[PDB]
Design a binder for these strands. Structure first.
Ligand SMILES: [Mn+2]
Ligand SMILES: [Mn+2]
Length: 116
DNA sequence: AATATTAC
């Protein structure tokens, strides 16, 4: 039985290559009930993988482990599944994934929130 | 969970 109940989410999509911008744009509508405040999306192309950090205005309660899955819009139309965690420190997470980044592979939206 | 071994 899986439950993530948090305002702040650290997503990881292994073996995933989605352009960070489209991952950001569609995760923003998937999460729109929780009013996303800030989103950062970083593709790492050295095990190719996505990291996403999401700061919402309301505590998101996620109980469907597939609710955030993403599908390519071209062949082979693969489902991409994330590790979904509550972020223990948004500053540490942000630091981790932006350090992992070229600035071509990054996508931000909104104003970063200074958690307390 | 459920990608996968990536994930503060
Ligand atoms: Mn990484
Ligand atoms: Mn870890």
């Amino acid at each position: 039985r899986f439950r993530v109940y948090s305002k702040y989410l650290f997503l990881t999509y292994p073996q995933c290559t989605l352009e960070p911008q489209y991952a950001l744009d569609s995760l923003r509508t998937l999460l729109n009930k929780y009013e996303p405040l800030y989103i950062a999306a970083v593709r790492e192309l050295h095990s190719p993988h996505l990291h996403v950090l999401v700061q919402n205005k309301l505590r998101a309660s996620i109980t469907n482990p597939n609710a955030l899955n993403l599908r390519m819009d071209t062949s082979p139309f693969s489902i991409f599944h994330p590790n979904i965690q509550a972020a223990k420190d948004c500053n540490q997470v942000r630091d981790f994934i932006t350090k992992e980044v070229s600035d071509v592979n990054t996508a931000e939206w909104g104003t970063f929130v200074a958690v307390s």
